[PDB]
């Protein structure tokens, strides 16, 4: 996170840290006691599928305070439409080996209904983005969880504003822009997979996933987030189904 602040301990209780062989991989979002939503691109280089761990209740990476709960990731479900090495359909659904125990420090973020998300949540201006990612473009990652408030943009406004820069990729219907074009504030590498959480009438909901952008907090550019509303039905169907052998699962989308 670039230009944000430390998330006071327990204020982003759905934030997940994904580890591979004990090393920081990506963020994620807890949506109930056994399911985590993250970004498909985080799993492009995994060979060590058996050593993928999700940590809930994490805050400061340098100290164990007893609120952390670790779970092995039993399955990583990616949409059939996701192509490795690309940015489109950038979502993954992770099943934990055993549920996390809900506490003041471990709470799920509400996965909203599609219509409510499209007709109400999509019009809430500001949302929170969080992670232990790079504090600066080409900089060190954070030891304490960071958070940033970002305004959402209509894709046309993002496209006209996000300068005619060669090979500037397409912002699809499975994405949205959020952030600032003045080079001050953005999510960054290491934050991928993390939540873009929206407040509505006293409750927080999952509306985006840290996915990509042209650098971090680059002038004329915005952060690009997976548009979670497109995947509600896909996620709901998978969560109502029985586990299958093998860690990686490709599931048809739609």
């Amino acid at each position: 996170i670039v230009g944000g602040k430390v998330c006071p301990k327990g204020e982003c209780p759905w934030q997940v840290l994904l580890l591979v062989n004990g090393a920081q991989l990506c963020g994620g979002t807890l949506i109930n006691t056994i399911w985590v939503v993250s970004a498909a691109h985080c799993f492009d280089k995994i060979k060590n599928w058996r050593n993928l761990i999700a940590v809930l209740g994490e805050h400061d990476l340098s100290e164990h305070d007893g609120d952390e709960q670790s779970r092995r990731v039993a399955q990583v479900i990616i949409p059939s439409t996701y192509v490795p090495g690309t940015t489109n359909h950038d979502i993954a659904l992770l099943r934990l080996h055993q549920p996390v125990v809900l506490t003041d420090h471990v709470v799920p973020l509400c996965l909203p209904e599609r219509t409510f998300s499209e007709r109400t949540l999509a019009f809430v201006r500001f949302s929170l983005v969080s992670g232990w990612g790079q504090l600066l473009d080409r900089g060190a990652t954070a030891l304490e969880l960071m958070v940033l408030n970002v305004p959402r943009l209509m894709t046309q406004d993002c496209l006209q504003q996000s300068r005619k820069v060669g090979d500037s990729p397409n912002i699809t219907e499975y994405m949205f822009c959020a952030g600032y074009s003045d080079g001050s504030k953005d999510s960054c590498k290491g934050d991928s997979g993390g939540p873009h959480a929206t407040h509505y009438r006293g409750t927080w909901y999952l509306t985006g996933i840290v996915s990509w952008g042209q650098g971090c907090a680059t002038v004329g550019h915005f952060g690009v987030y997976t548009r979670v509303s497109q995947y509600i039905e896909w996620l709901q169907k998978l969560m109502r189904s029985e586990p299958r052998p093998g860690v990686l699962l490709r599931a048809p989308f739609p």
Binding site: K9, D104, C110, P112, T115, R119, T120, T203, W204
Partner: protein, 55 residues
């Protein structure tokens, strides 16, 4: 009805045949007798921050 200000619902809204509207809540919440408000039915309902709720 649901298209305008979420049909007045705190959480989810369903339009019905005619002028009928039903608000609903996410699991771990119950709808109040006003037919619009959602109240937690569990200790850790989704999307609420305990350290802030207890404050």
């Amino acid at each position: 009805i649901c298209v305008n200000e979420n049909g007045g619902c705190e959480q989810y809204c369903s339009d019905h045949t005619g002028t009928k509207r039903s608000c609903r809540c996410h699991e771990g919440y119950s709808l109040l007798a006003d037919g619009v408000s959602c109240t937690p039915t569990v200790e850790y309902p989704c999307g609420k921050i305990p350290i802030l709720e207890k404050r």
